[PDB]
Symmetry: D3
Amino acid sequence: ANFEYIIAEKRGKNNTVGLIQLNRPKALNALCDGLIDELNQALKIFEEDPAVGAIVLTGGDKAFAAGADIKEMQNLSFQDCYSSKFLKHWDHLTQVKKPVIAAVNGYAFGGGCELAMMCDIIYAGEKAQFAQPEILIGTIPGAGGTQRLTRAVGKSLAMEMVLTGDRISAQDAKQAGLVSKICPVETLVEEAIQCAEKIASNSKIVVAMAKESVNAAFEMTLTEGSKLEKKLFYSTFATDDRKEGMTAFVEKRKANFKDQ
Amino acid sequence: ANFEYIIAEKRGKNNTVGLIQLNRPKALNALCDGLIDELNQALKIFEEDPAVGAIVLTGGDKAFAAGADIKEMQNLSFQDCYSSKFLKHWDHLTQVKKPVIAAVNGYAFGGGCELAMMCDIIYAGEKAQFAQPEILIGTIPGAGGTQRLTRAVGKSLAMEMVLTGDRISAQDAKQAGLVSKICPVETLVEEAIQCAEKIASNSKIVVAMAKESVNAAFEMTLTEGSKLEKKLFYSTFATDDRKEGMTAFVEKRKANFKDQ
Amino acid sequence: ANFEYIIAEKRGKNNTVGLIQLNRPKALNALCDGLIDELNQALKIFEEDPAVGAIVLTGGDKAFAAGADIKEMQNLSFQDCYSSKFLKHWDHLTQVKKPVIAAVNGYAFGGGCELAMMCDIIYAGEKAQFAQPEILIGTIPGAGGTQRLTRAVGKSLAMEMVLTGDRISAQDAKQAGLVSKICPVETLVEEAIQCAEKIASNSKIVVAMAKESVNAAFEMTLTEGSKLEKKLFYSTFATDDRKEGMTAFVEKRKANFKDQ
Amino acid sequence: ANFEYIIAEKRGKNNTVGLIQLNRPKALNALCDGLIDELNQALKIFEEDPAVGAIVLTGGDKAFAAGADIKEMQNLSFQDCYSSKFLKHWDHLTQVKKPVIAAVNGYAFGGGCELAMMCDIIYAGEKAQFAQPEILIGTIPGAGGTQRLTRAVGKSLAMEMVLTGDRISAQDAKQAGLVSKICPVETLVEEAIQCAEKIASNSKIVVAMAKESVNAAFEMTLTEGSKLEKKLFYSTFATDDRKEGMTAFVEKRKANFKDQ
Amino acid sequence: ANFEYIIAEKRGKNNTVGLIQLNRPKALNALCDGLIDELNQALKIFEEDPAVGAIVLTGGDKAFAAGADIKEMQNLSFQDCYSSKFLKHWDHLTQVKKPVIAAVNGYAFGGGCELAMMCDIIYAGEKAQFAQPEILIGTIPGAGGTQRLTRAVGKSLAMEMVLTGDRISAQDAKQAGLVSKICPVETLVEEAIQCAEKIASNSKIVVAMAKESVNAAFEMTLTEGSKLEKKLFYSTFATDDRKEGMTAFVEKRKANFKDQ
Amino acid sequence: ANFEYIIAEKRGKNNTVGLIQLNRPKALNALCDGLIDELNQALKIFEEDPAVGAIVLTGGDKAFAAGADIKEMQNLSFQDCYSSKFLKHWDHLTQVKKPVIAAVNGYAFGGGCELAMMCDIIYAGEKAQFAQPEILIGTIPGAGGTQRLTRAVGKSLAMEMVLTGDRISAQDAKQAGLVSKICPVETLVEEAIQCAEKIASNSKIVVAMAKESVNAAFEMTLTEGSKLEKKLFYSTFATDDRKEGMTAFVEKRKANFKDQ
Ligand SMILES: [Mg+2]
Ligand SMILES: [Mg+2]
Ligand SMILES: [Mg+2]
Ligand SMILES: [Mg+2]
């Protein structure tokens, strides 16, 4: 319902896309515990909604998210960290079944960068900037900064970025495979919506098998990933939407999915 | 035998390349059971031919393969699929020990795209297009689409492709690493045959060991992939061609290999 | 000490960067046992040196290294290789805690390419050329040319390089993610040192944990990698530098790391 | 809260053990939503209670848990199962960071057995029986039943148990290492508490890491397990309870752990 | 067909079990290429036969199989082996979707023991002996004898068996978990048939999934193995036999499975 | 050299076994640095000695190794363990190419138990006891005692031993697969030497390959485990000893292996 760190609203034609704007520009959308709490509540209600098929995540023109809130972390001990399982809440984004598109304008550093990488797709603004400056303040990134980055971008660029704290541009991010489309700043959010919209017009149950199938590519060997894929593939033949979509092509007419 | 769906021919210098062309242009080379049946026969003849050192696979100038034959899948049940090991036959291509180069002009969609990714090397034409549009017909890619794509191009672009069914250009695929060379439509097939000629000049057995070692990059941690590679490496030192290859270099002369 | 195959000097402000220059130019820095033996000695004293934070490894302007010494390999048998654990001494470079940057001008072929790929970051000169031509001498890459290359560059290009022995430009290399920056031949080594310089001013302990985390991306599933990253992340909180880094940030001043 | 399917109470001298007893004897502690929901609340509490060092899970004397509530699963569709993750909340045992010990008297069938296997340590009564009989009612085990059983017991016996639904005694389970102790029915829960009470004596933080390290053995290669273990083994030196544990030993006395 | 090396017959009440008896006693069922071709033939027709729900593989009373045929392997070079993919044809048994039970009487040495380990369940006779004696003829086991054995029995005993060639008894093997039952010599095969009979009572499709799930235990981390298990579990809710099976339990009657 | 903590000498038929006896009985063979240093020198020597084919490691009748040495460890900080790569030198055992057998009489606790488990084979005297009591002094095992133990013995017993520090008997260890023989105390060492003699009379090169194939069971999936095994299986066909073994068999005579 009511939110003070973010702005969540349904968007697209037929409102089939849920947009989540991080709205804490004063500290460039720095990711405190209360901010994350609210994104999780927001994600939950969009996951729960039957009309919603794809979620789009963004911040402002200047920043997607500058990073973790450093003023909270400052006095933590080792024991405090391990016992509490600090940054457990931050992983929620990777357990949503419906797909999430990151629309990243301006700065995505540290947590913000890590948040974008947890998403399934990233669209970048022209003046978007990606970095993992943790090393500069005596830590390493602790939310897949080392894992998801390196897998996208390759060892040499990940090592360079993680060990120096250096930033890369949206153009390089695209070239390296971290992001998959570059858009003007003014139309970025809209272009992500139109993509989210396309995905939303496909069957929710099958779309979720697809997403799950693509995430197995980082969790197992190709041989077993192939096998797992074949079983999700076979599974689709137990859905109505799969008979609908395939007989639509053969009849040369428009398909209509009931997410079933 | 005598094919109805494909053209299999020896090409290159001294006919050391096996060219398989998918020749079902009325259906945009849609990969029906009968066509894969023949493709697999051609693959087996060239595997057994001591003359042949590498294989190039193509379709027409308009289409490589537009997909699986959606008219055949229309009335499959979940039981039909599981107990038929449906699409298993499509994997014979992954068991070929000689290198296979895919020369993709025009459309390589869905099944067609997957066939391309199973090959060791992909060359694309200027107007080539890749897509996994199974999501539009209410399935997911069921022949490595999600696995090989994601491993080649990174999450963002694979998620966008599989979830929306969108197409990427020849040039989008080169930048992503899905393909390794772009050619003029008119010379693609010849450029691929030249690449196959080179490979064929090398020792078949050490070439087989190299391909096996490269494929292992997706089946193992790096530590064990490194251990596997050494076993193959040391193994080469039991071949006549290794001795000849290194003696050629020391005597400043051309190597003349004997597949042994 | 007094090496004959290499030069080793401390560089950067306050001699915080170790530079190793392969100096066997008459043989294009071909990696004979003697040379690798000196390389490892030099890595050891830099690794043991508390002033040094980073290591830059380079060759000549014409050649980084043109491969493993083929004359030493020529008369080896299978039994010689296996029992002598041939090439095992090369791996010492993968075991150094501190970051190593390759600065590649000219040829990096076969073992030379493999040596570069074992470093964390690769910087390339505008005329650098990468290749794995082992197949042309009747062997396969035996020091991770099929493992690390594939993981960087993708299957297609890797297969094409490994099976044909063909070379790729510095520009190709960067595009494929094998290298993270290209520079002019003239200033490569100085720009590599500058990168090393930044890294070396960060906490040596947390930097080492950072690197150990990024390398984990090739040794485990993303799930376990994430868990490993967290364990290391929490571990930083037991260090003096991690407090000194964050407190320096908050107070808006220079952090003063004591590598502890 | 005042539970209706279970009993949850603190036990041992100084009440340092959590005991959860499944109390649905009429249905032979068959697992239904209502029972699982409460078990999960009881785990949550004991995990939060700083006096609780270990948990014991048990049933009655005739039955630990005799399978699941099949009357609930009876009308379910495939879609219903997948969309609404079925048996998701049956998994919180695998997320408790303190050690849980199954104390199995009588039948542990279907989910019963799975529930026991999800625990760290299984103690079995003399007349205890284990089976995965889901095959007989047209399913397969869906709570790690094929996965944890096989890794405990081995392929032959796991395959025999799963494909026939046949039952093994406590004596067979012990031989095969599914359970690690056999006790008289009368004193089973009593032995389980004594074992739990020793575990409760140790440092809560250091016990937690030891647990995570053992669990690692089923999720990584031996190579990386060893690395992970080492890193946790280094972590212990950040804690007071290790400084305290070792200095108590060298001073020849009993140690006072503060779970820190 | 007209098998010269084996005997294949349907067995059990209702002929729902297929028996394959290796019948080359003059060579102690040594596994020459001819014998394996026929074994593979028999497996295929029992795999295709809809009445057959489980297979039993045996040899004679003196010998299950004494190993790979050492007279055939004698004159093979390294080149021959690698290029001929030697022993690759043995793996077809691992591709059968129906369960296979090895009934081992007397000698199961080297390849004999490897073949039995490829089966899903092993029943051993009181006088059976297991060994991997390849080392005493200057090879290692090359059909899973280092891999399955180790996984069943543990490092210490595997290392002992493979490095010395020493044999173990049925009792040793049961203790180690290589075999799940010991039978008298004279009723072993019938006892095995009775295990097959029970397996054949259940739904062939759900049994195929069950078997496929248990095999996954050796190919994945426990985390991925559970998600694969969950997906197969859900898949069963798409079959006739699971509703029938569950509705038959609730109604306290005998289920009638349709393998569907 | 002139050892002060160990006794090293050649034993067995023709002095082909290398015996390392830990000889610090009054400290129950606690694994201090001086002793591990010497151990490693002794491994290096027997590994280089072409007379030696296998190694037996032991302590005295009352103790194999009571563990590590808390005095050394008492003041270690977190930073000092990580920076100094603590217990790195304790791993050299896992890098010997020749087989190592442990002959464990009496106490093998903590570091002593890990040291045993690092060996290929464990033989235990009738009064042997195994334990991992690190938890009682506030650490976890740091030398694979959470990893090798769990793989050998199963989760329940592993969790029990590590979380309580409780001993198990020699008889319990064999039941669980941690050790492969139990011997009378007085003849233990001689039985281990007999087992070593057998190994030493086989081909060293093929023995080493076999040990490698077995060690791989814990480093990859069974699919890739099998492929690695095949590559080693073929490589033996490059050796003289394989031809000699198979020919010996064919000519009804004793093989005479030459280590080649
Ligand atoms: Mg090389
Ligand atoms: Mg790339
Ligand atoms: Mg066991
Ligand atoms: Mg054999």
